[PDB]
Design a protein around this motif. Structure first.
Motif, PDB file in Angstrom:
ATOM      1  N   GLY A  15       0.808  -1.200   0.000  1.00  0.00           N
ATOM      2  CA  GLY A  15       0.000   0.000   0.000  1.00  0.00           C
ATOM      3  C   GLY A  15       0.849   1.261   0.000  1.00  0.00           C
ATOM      4  O   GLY A  15       2.081   1.203  -0.043  1.00  0.00           O
ATOM      5  N   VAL A  16       0.160   2.404   0.035  1.00  0.00           N
ATOM      6  CA  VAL A  16       0.822   3.693   0.201  1.00  0.00           C
ATOM      7  C   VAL A  16       0.051   4.529   1.221  1.00  0.00           C
ATOM      8  O   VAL A  16      -1.185   4.552   1.227  1.00  0.00           O
ATOM      9  CB  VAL A  16       1.000   4.417  -1.157  1.00  0.00           C
ATOM     10  CG1 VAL A  16      -0.292   4.667  -1.844  1.00  0.00           C
ATOM     11  CG2 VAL A  16       1.707   5.735  -0.984  1.00  0.00           C
ATOM     12  N   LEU A  17       0.800   5.177   2.124  1.00  0.00           N
ATOM     13  CA  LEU A  17       0.250   5.869   3.277  1.00  0.00           C
ATOM     14  C   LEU A  17      -0.046   7.333   2.987  1.00  0.00           C
ATOM     15  O   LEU A  17       0.762   8.034   2.373  1.00  0.00           O
ATOM     16  CB  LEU A  17       1.226   5.788   4.451  1.00  0.00           C
ATOM     17  CG  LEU A  17       0.909   6.532   5.748  1.00  0.00           C
ATOM     18  CD1 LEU A  17      -0.436   6.129   6.336  1.00  0.00           C
ATOM     19  CD2 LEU A  17       2.014   6.272   6.754  1.00  0.00           C
ATOM     20  N   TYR A  18      -1.199   7.790   3.462  1.00  0.00           N
ATOM     21  CA  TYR A  18      -1.496   9.201   3.653  1.00  0.00           C
ATOM     22  C   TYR A  18      -1.753   9.433   5.138  1.00  0.00           C
ATOM     23  O   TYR A  18      -2.713   8.885   5.691  1.00  0.00           O
ATOM     24  CB  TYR A  18      -2.708   9.627   2.830  1.00  0.00           C
ATOM     25  CG  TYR A  18      -2.405   9.892   1.379  1.00  0.00           C
ATOM     26  CD1 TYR A  18      -1.116  10.183   0.962  1.00  0.00           C
ATOM     27  CD2 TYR A  18      -3.416   9.859   0.426  1.00  0.00           C
ATOM     28  CE1 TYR A  18      -0.834  10.438  -0.354  1.00  0.00           C
ATOM     29  CE2 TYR A  18      -3.146  10.110  -0.903  1.00  0.00           C
ATOM     30  CZ  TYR A  18      -1.851  10.399  -1.287  1.00  0.00           C
ATOM     31  OH  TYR A  18      -1.568  10.650  -2.611  1.00  0.00           O
ATOM     32  N   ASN A  19      -0.912  10.238   5.778  1.00  0.00           N
ATOM     33  CA  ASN A  19      -1.098  10.506   7.199  1.00  0.00           C
ATOM     34  C   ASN A  19      -0.902  11.985   7.490  1.00  0.00           C
ATOM     35  O   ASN A  19      -0.205  12.686   6.755  1.00  0.00           O
ATOM     36  CB  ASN A  19      -0.153   9.665   8.076  1.00  0.00           C
ATOM     37  CG  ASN A  19       1.306   9.809   7.702  1.00  0.00           C
ATOM     38  OD1 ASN A  19       1.650  10.475   6.728  1.00  0.00           O
ATOM     39  ND2 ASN A  19       2.181   9.205   8.498  1.00  0.00           N
ATOM     40  N   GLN A  20      -1.575  12.436   8.557  1.00  0.00           N
ATOM     41  CA  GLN A  20      -1.332  13.727   9.207  1.00  0.00           C
ATOM     42  C   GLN A  20      -1.528  14.904   8.253  1.00  0.00           C
ATOM     43  O   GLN A  20      -0.642  15.742   8.085  1.00  0.00           O
ATOM     44  CB  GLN A  20       0.063  13.760   9.839  1.00  0.00           C
ATOM     45  N   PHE A  21      -2.692  14.951   7.618  1.00  0.00           N
ATOM     46  CA  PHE A  21      -2.990  16.044   6.703  1.00  0.00           C
ATOM     47  C   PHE A  21      -3.185  17.348   7.477  1.00  0.00           C
ATOM     48  O   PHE A  21      -3.436  17.354   8.683  1.00  0.00           O
ATOM     49  CB  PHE A  21      -4.236  15.728   5.874  1.00  0.00           C
ATOM     50  CG  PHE A  21      -4.071  14.548   4.960  1.00  0.00           C
ATOM     51  CD1 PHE A  21      -3.474  14.692   3.719  1.00  0.00           C
ATOM     52  CD2 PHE A  21      -4.516  13.292   5.339  1.00  0.00           C
ATOM     53  CE1 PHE A  21      -3.319  13.606   2.879  1.00  0.00           C
ATOM     54  CE2 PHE A  21      -4.368  12.205   4.502  1.00  0.00           C
ATOM     55  CZ  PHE A  21      -3.769  12.362   3.268  1.00  0.00           C
ATOM     56  N   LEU A  22      -3.037  18.462   6.770  1.00  0.00           N
ATOM     57  CA  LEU A  22      -3.167  19.765   7.404  1.00  0.00           C
ATOM     58  C   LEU A  22      -4.615  20.219   7.538  1.00  0.00           C
ATOM     59  O   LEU A  22      -4.878  21.184   8.274  1.00  0.00           O
ATOM     60  CB  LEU A  22      -2.367  20.817   6.632  1.00  0.00           C
ATOM     61  N   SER A  23      -5.552  19.561   6.865  1.00  0.00           N
ATOM     62  CA  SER A  23      -6.944  19.979   6.880  1.00  0.00           C
ATOM     63  C   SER A  23      -7.821  18.739   6.884  1.00  0.00           C
ATOM     64  O   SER A  23      -7.351  17.622   7.120  1.00  0.00           O
ATOM     65  CB  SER A  23      -7.243  20.895   5.684  1.00  0.00           C
TER      66      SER A  23
END
Ligand SMILES: [Zn+2]
Ligand SMILES: [Zn+2]
Ligand SMILES: [Zn+2]
Ligand SMILES: [Zn+2]
Lengths: 263, 78, 331, 436
Positions: free
Chosen positions: D384-392
């Motif tokens: 997989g690929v991670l998306y974490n800790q977005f600013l909004s």
């Protein structure tokens, strides 16, 4: 596993009058439509079975029972034996005068017991459904009504459907049979299209009667007459010894010479 | 009314001559125009399709009229 | 037999509902097997005799209960037997009260009816509330006929009842023997020198569809939860509306017959004969079956009396059980 | 294995013939063997409809075809119509108003009408020959010292994905597709041979059409009557001697003019040999509630198969006694077998005393098997690929919605903004981030 038993009313007198009529439609296209219906029935599924009987005027001889011209092979052998059997039947023939109207009760009897023995042949996994097509073209004799009802009730018990394509004339006993057993009756309005009637109405089996929209059932006449004057009855007198229909009340019962108790 | 027994002899002659020469299978059996007219007939607007199995009913006010007819047929039955 | 038979036949079935119905001599308990073969019995009796009727009494707890009234269509009787699987079978039977209810209904059927009672009877204590020899004298004088099919024993009172009223008594070994006994009581039994030979007035109503697309029809409901009947069967006496034929006229007393229903039971009158059964090879110049055109691969060959053609075992069972005529003698 | 595992999927002649070229199909129905063979595969509705419309020259309107069926069965009806339409039987024509007429394919219909009209070895020894040759191929897959395969067939087994050759100094192994191939029915195994054999029919100058017409010509033949070869091309001779190597056809000599279609060749059909009993061989495995297999058959092949999905204790000259241990099945799935192969295997070879039962194979035993089924395979892996800790949070559901839009969503979060996208399809959304 299904079992079509075609019965073709090969009256030599009727088809002889049809072939001296010099029409388009003779016995050759009749027996050829029979064989194309038979090869179509064997063609629809591998497990199907076929038997073709020909009621002659004095005998119920069965017709049925490599590839040179491109058919399937068993269709070729079945067509060869049906062709050679009708050529042995109709050409080598006889002439008598007291019994010249065709029969249908005996060929139906042979069909009933043939379906019985072929249902004993069936193993426990599979199960056989069965029907009898009757292709009638002559006038049935009245004289075998006592016999004829019996084979209908046998087909009532043995759960064999009965279908009928009548060609020239209507037949009350045979539409009666197709009413009792649950079969189907059809009077063809134009002769040479016979095969196309069979391949849509009488080719489809029991689990396609319920799917196809078919020509509707004609109303069946339950006419009844006396044994006295043969005229139509709405209220009759029936004995309890002879079990026979009388129209008008009579003192002495003629059918069984009964010493009738009078009150 | 089967006619005179001359016809017996005539028909025996013609059908003994008839069933000697036999088996055309491709040619003689069906003309295609007869098959097209047969499909025209067995189509729902032609002959042998009697315009039957219609049974047009009058199911408009079923239930209370059925109760009326239950009372009426019981009474007239008695 | 070439003898007179009782062809209009108000038969009336009296079943035990005793304590001994719950005994497990059969493979299910006797109630279940008896009731299954009565379902088969109603089926074959209405399959073979169409004019006749059946009524079913369960006899239970020293009292008798007319479970299904005397009618002539298998739907109500088999529906009631499917209900009567679920019963309890408590108490001792009562032959007195059951023969009393069967007599009470079978007094006033007309005299040409061979009025018959079939008592499928199991237990031994026949707990009557009165004297049951005056019933047997009455039922002797009321020309009824009572036949008892017995379970596990021979009882003297049922023997006297059977031999005096005119019937036949039988005791059961197996499933197969009990099927043979009920099959023996399907067929119309021959008449004594006592039963009236009358001439019942009969009616033969034609079928009438909605006349010409209901152009001046007669819209009726029925005559015995029904819909709107457009057409059907009338009556030639009272001009009522019946759906099904044959039905005794509910408001006239006429009997209504389509007349293959007279032809469904014509084989009793000009009956079959015996097949000369010979197992060996024996002169057979006719190798093939005259029945269905097949070879005789077994050592049983059956030859008729009049025409003396050839038949095999399959044609034997089929001709003698179902087709009821020799195919040769028609020709 | 970052994809899913090799699940052995039988095509059942629909996904094979539905998915070809229609010119290939219109040549394919040019022999009556193929028309009967596609006919019997059809569902019973389409079966009866073809046999209805067969003797007919007019394109019937759509109203009659939809109006031949009772109302309750429309959900099970459109499958037969769509299967007739996609398989180039029903080609659609027009009645001269707007009624879309339907007519059977006149190439197919004309060549069936050509098929119907104008246009010494012993039988149990043939059974023995079938058993010998096909069990030699099965022993070759198992890896016995009976390896009489003549190395074109071994190359075929390597080419179909069954026996992978690795480190080319001749170890032929077994792929997990080979293990799932072993536990399958004999007509299913032979038809899988023919499907993966014709999958690579672009190799030896072979054409699909003549070979499938010869297969359907074999399986509609008779053991008794004998055939000849004259009327066949030389590539047909190469295919027929390769087929002799299969064991589906008993020759006498290579230069001869005669072949005997074997009992394996007749029961070549895309279907199921049963759930309690086989026409080929009567069943022989008694599966008792003790998890206890009683095999009444002496054969090293079937002993090896029962060794695959069980563990074996006693061996008598009539019988083998084995126990289905949890660890035996967890070994049989480590090599890779989905345990519908096992249950259908035991239902296929069900002994005739195990019959007369409500269930061919013990349901309680199956439940026990599921319990056993859950311990070795408890990890499921995905790249997989991670998306974490977005600013909004608006861009959170925007990235999630763009993932759902291009079908690359894998795992989502609700609270702490921790998303999983496909890593190979990530560069689309990554260049979308450089565009907004
Ligand atoms: Zn009389
Ligand atoms: Zn009346
Ligand atoms: Zn006789
Ligand atoms: Zn016979």
């Amino acid at each position: 596993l299904n079992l079509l038993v075609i019965v073709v009313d090969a009256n030599p007198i009727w088809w002889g009058k049809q072939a001296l009529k010099e029409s388009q439609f003779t016995l050759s296209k009749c027996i050829d439509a029979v064989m194309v219906l038979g090869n179509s029935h064997l063609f629809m599924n591998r497990s199907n079975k076929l038997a073709v009987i020909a009621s002659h005027i004095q005998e119920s001889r069965f017709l049925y029972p490599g590839s040179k011209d491109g058919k399937y092979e068993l269709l070729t052998s079945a067509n060869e034996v049906i062709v050679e059997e009708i050529k042995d039947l109709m050409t080598k023939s006889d002439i008598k005068g007291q019994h010249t109207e065709t029969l249908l009760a005996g060929s139906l009897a042979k069909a009933l017991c043939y379906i019985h023995r072929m249902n004993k042949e069936v193993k426990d996994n599979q199960e056989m459904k069965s029907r009898i097509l009757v292709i009638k073209a002559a006038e049935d004799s009245a004289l075998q009504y006592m016999n004829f009802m019996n084979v209908i009730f046998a087909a009532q018990k043995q759960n064999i459907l009965i279908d009928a394509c009548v060609l020239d004339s209507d037949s009350g006993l045979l539409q009666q049979a197709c009413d009792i057993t649950g079969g189907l009756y059809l009077k063809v309005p134009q002769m040479p299209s016979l095969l196309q009637y069979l391949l849509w109405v009488f080719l489809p089996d029991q689990d396609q009667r319920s799917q196809l929209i078919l020509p509707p059932p004609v109303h069946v006449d339950y006419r009844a007459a006396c044994f006295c004057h043969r005229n139509l009855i709405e209220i009759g007198y029936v004995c309890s010894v002879c079990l026979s229909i009388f129209c008008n009340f009579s003192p002495i019962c003629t059918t069984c010479e009964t010493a009738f108790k009078i009150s | 009314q089967y006619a005179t027994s001359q016809d017996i002899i005539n028909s025996f002659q013609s059908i003994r001559q008839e069933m000697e020469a036999y088996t055309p299978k491709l040619t003689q059996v069906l003309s295609s125009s007869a098959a097209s007219s047969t499909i025209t007939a067995l189509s729902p607007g032609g002959a042998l399709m009697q315009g039957g199995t219609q049974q047009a009913i009058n199911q408009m006010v079923p239930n209370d009229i059925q109760s009326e007819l239950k009372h009426l047929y019981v009474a007239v039955g008695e | 037999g070439q003898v007179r038979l009782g062809m209009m036949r108000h038969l009336y079935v009296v079943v035990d509902g005793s304590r001994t119905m719950e005994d497990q001599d059969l493979k299910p308990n006797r109630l279940t097997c008896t009731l299954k073969l009565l379902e088969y019995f109603v089926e074959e009796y209405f399959d073979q005799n169409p004019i006749s009727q059946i009524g079913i009494i369960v006899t239970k707890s020293k009292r008798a209960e007319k479970l299904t009234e005397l009618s002539g269509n298998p739907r109500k009787h088999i529906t009631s037997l499917k209900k009567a699987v679920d019963m309890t079978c408590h108490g001792e039977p009562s032959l007195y009260n059951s023969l009393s209810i069967a007599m009470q209904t079978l007094k006033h059927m007309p005299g040409h009816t061979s009025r018959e009672v079939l008592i499928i009877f199991s237990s031994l204590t026949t707990c009557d509330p009165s004297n049951i020899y005056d019933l047997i004298k009455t039922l002797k004088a009321a020309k009824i006929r009572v036949s008892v099919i017995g379970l596990s024993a021979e009882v003297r009172v049922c023997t006297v009842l059977a031999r005096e009223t005119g019937g036949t008594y039988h005791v059961i070994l197996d499933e197969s023997h009990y099927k043979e006994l009920l099959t023996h009581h399907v067929s119309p039994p021959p008449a004594s020198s006592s039963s009236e030979c009358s001439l019942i007035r009969m009616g033969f109503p034609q079928h009438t569809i909605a006349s010409l697309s209901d152009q001046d029809a007669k819209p009726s409901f029925s005559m015995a939860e029904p819909g709107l009947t457009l057409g059907g069967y009338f009556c030639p006496q009272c001009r009522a509306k019946y759906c099904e034929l044959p039905v005794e006229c509910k408001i006239c007393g006429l009997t209504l017959v389509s007349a293959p229903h007279l032809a469904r039971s014509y084989h009793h009158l000009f009956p079959l004969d015996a097949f000369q059964e010979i197992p060996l090879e024996e002169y057979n110049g006719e190798r093939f079956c005259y029945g269905c055109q097949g070879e005789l691969k077994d050592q049983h060959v059956y030859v008729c009396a009049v025409c003396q053609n050839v038949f095999c075992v399959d044609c034997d069972v089929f001709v003698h059980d179902s087709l009821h005529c020799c195919p040769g003698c028609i020709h | 294995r970052g994809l899913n595992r090799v699940h052995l999927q039988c095509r059942n002649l629909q996904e094979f013939l539905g998915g070809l070229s229609p010119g290939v199909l219109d040549r394919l129905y040019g022999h009556p063997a193929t028309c009967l063979a596609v006919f019997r595969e059809l569902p019973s509705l389409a079966k009866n409809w073809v046999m209805r419309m067969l003797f007919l020259e007019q394109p019937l309107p759509q109203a009659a075809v939809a109006l031949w069926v009772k109302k309750e069965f429309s959900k099970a009806q459109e499958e037969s119509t769509g299967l007739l339409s996609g398989l180039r039987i029903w080609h659609t024509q027009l009645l001269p108003g707007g009624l879309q007429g339907l007519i059977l394919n006149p190439i197919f219909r004309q060549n069936l009408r050509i098929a119907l009209l104008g246009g010494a070895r012993d039988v149990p020894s043939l059974d023995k020959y079938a058993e010998e040759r096909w069990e030699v191929v099965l022993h070759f897959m198992v890896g016995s010292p009976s390896a009489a395969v003549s190395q074109d067939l071994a190359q075929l087994l390597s080419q179909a994905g069954l026996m992978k050759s690795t480190e080319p100094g001749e170890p032929p192994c077994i792929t997990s597709a080979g293990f799932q191939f072993l536990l399958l029915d004999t007509p299913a195994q032979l038809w899988y041979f023919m499907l993966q054999y014709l999958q690579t029919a672009q190799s030896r100058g072979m054409d699909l059409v003549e070979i499938l017409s010869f297969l359907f010509q074999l399986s509609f033949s008779t053991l008794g009557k004998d055939y000849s070869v004259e009327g066949m091309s030389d590539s047909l001779l190469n295919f027929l001697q390769h087929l002799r190597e299969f064991g589906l056809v008993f020759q006498r000599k290579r230069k001869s003019r005669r072949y005997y279609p074997t009992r394996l060749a007749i029961n070549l059909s895309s279907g199921v040999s049963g759930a309690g009993g086989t026409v080929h061989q009567p069943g022989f495995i008694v599966v008792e509630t003790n998890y206890r297999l009683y095999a009444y058959t002496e054969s090293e092949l079937q002993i090896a198969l029962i060794a695959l999905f069980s563990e074996m204790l006693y061996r008598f000259p009539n019988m083998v006694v084995a126990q289905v241990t949890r660890e035996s099945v967890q070994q049989a799935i480590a090599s890779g077998i989905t345990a519908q192969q096992i249950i259908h295997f035991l239902r296929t070879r069900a002994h005739p005393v195990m019959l007369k039962q409500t269930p061919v194979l013990p349901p309680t035993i199956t439940d026990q098997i599921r319990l056993w089924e859950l311990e070795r395979d408890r990890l499921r892996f995905t790249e997989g690929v991670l998306y974490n800790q977005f600013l909004s949070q608006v861009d959170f559901e925007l990235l999630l919605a763009h993932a759902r839009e291009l079908g690359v969503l894998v795992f989502e979060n609700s609270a702490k903004r921790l998303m999983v996208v496909t890593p190979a399809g990530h560069s689309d959304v990554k260049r979308f981030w450089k565009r907004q």
